[PDB]
Amino acid sequence: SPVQYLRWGDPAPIAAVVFACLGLLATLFVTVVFIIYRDTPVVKSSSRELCYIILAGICLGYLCTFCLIAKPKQIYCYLQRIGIGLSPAMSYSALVTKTYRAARILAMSKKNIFEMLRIDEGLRLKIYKDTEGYYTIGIGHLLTKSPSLNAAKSELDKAIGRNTNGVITKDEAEKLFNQDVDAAVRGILRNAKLKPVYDSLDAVRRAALINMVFQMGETGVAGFTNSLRMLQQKRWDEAAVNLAKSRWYNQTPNRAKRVITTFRTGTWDAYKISACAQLVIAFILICIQLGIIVALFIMEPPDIMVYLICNTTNLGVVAPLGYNGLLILACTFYAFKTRNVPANFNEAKYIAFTMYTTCIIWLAFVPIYFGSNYKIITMCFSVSLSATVALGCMFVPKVYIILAKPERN
């Protein structure tokens, strides 16, 4: 009885239980919310099935402190290792497929704008010079500021990842272009006249705006004051008419006509330009962890050594802990990659923060746990804190909006 230990003077096991209890209730609350309102755009725009896996992993995460705090039974040693090992995997291997999809969608977004300027501005697969005379390659991607031709080749090789000999490919020219795209977005967001317009437009229309930036410059696009206001108020047809009167339209009519047309329809007509599949991959990554756990049940049979001490050695803990680490690393990688993606009410920003914190919790866990003489309680708290952070940062914001702010939805 945890109460007894509290009466004895040890408040550790009674605290871990309450922590778990408050966590189970919280998870129970959030899940029910996503069930009732499963038709609302805040829940429908994401992956409903993956959450059911992420929420289930968190639930078992809290159920762990009932295996670390229990009557001395043999199967509870089994439930421990199988709960501390798989529960994170069910959350991070289902989240990695989410972040990977998010990253794959984004990568395809940058693919379209690349094919946009390749047609509108052009491309060179070998090093050349611009008007200013500096060494350049691809779609106007500056390599270096030195007169040395050798300087451009070094910067290029370091930039690509191989010995290019001053010659690249379309895919490698896309890589360098991705950099120039992001650098352009930075300037736009730091331009007071261009920022509100960029924020209002959709995905396709943002590419049309950047196109104009890569032609006339930030200071130039700001010259379209009246036109930009029309676009921000979503007056496309008026904006097109207004833009077809500009010197920019009369000076470069072939290109401008296409950029303008993109503004009109919000599509790529002017240019020649799976949910079940994720459920199998998530299932696979979970089974891999299960295999490691089952294997360690065979190699090292669990045995009983309020507190339930199991004979679980270091290897019994390190190997699954290592595997989860990779799951977390993959997540954080794709999460940071999609951190600025505003899809699903800027959902990605919460996912990035969660992984950041999770990385810190798990790195700190290694020296603390393996250097502790109170490993079970450090396990309980570490485990619940990790499950709580995932729940608090990813789902509570979704749950807040769906209960407190119905109209925003």
Q: Contact positions toward ligand 51D, by CB under 6 A?
A: 57-58, 61, 64, 84, 87-88, 91, 317, 321, 361-362, 365, 382-383, 386-387, 390
As measured in angstroms, the least distance from the Cβ of 361 to ligand 51D is 5
230 binds, among ligand 51D, ligand OLA, none (CB under 5 to 8 A by kind): none
Residue that the structure tokens 């290019």 belong to:
164
Query: After what residue numbers is the chain broken, C–N > 2.5 angstroms?
Result: 273, 305
Q: Which two tokens stand for residue 322?
A: 């290592």
Which CB atom, from 13 or from 138, has the smaller least distance to ligand 51D? 13
Residue 287 binds ligand OLA, judged by CB under 6 A = no
Q: Which of positions 51-110 make contact with ligand OLA (CB under 6 A)? A: 66, 69-71, 82
Task: Find out whether 336 is annotated in a ligand binding site.
Answer: no
Per-residue HEC secondary structure of 194-233 comes to CHHHHHHCCHHHHHHHHHHHHHHCHHHHCCCHHHHHHHHC
Go through 72-105 and write b for each residue having 16 or more CB atoms within 10 A of its CB, e for each that does not: eeeebbbbbbbbbbbbbbbbbbbbbbbbbbbbee
Which CB atom, from 348 or from 379, has the smaller least distance to ligand 51D? 379
Question: How many residues are present in the chain?
Answer: 409
Go through 181-194 and write b for each residue having 16 or more CB atoms within 10 A of its CB, e for each that does not: beebbeebeebeeb
Residue 22 binds ligand OLA, judged by CB under 6 A = yes
- 339: which DSSP letter? T
Residue 335 binds ligand OLA, judged by CB under 6 A = no
- Is 49 one of the annotated active-site residues of the chain? no
Secondary structure (3-state) at 348? helix
CB 304 within 8 A of CB 310: yes
Which CB atom, from 61 or from 138, has the smaller least distance to ligand OLA? 61
Residue 362 binds ligand OLA, judged by CB under 6 A = yes
Task: Find out whether 114 is annotated in a ligand binding site.
Answer: no
As measured in angstroms, the least distance from the Cβ of 372 to ligand 51D is 12
Which CB atom, from 136 or from 382, has the smaller least distance to ligand 51D? 382
Residue 15 binds ligand OLA, judged by CB under 6 A = no
Active site residues: 121, 130
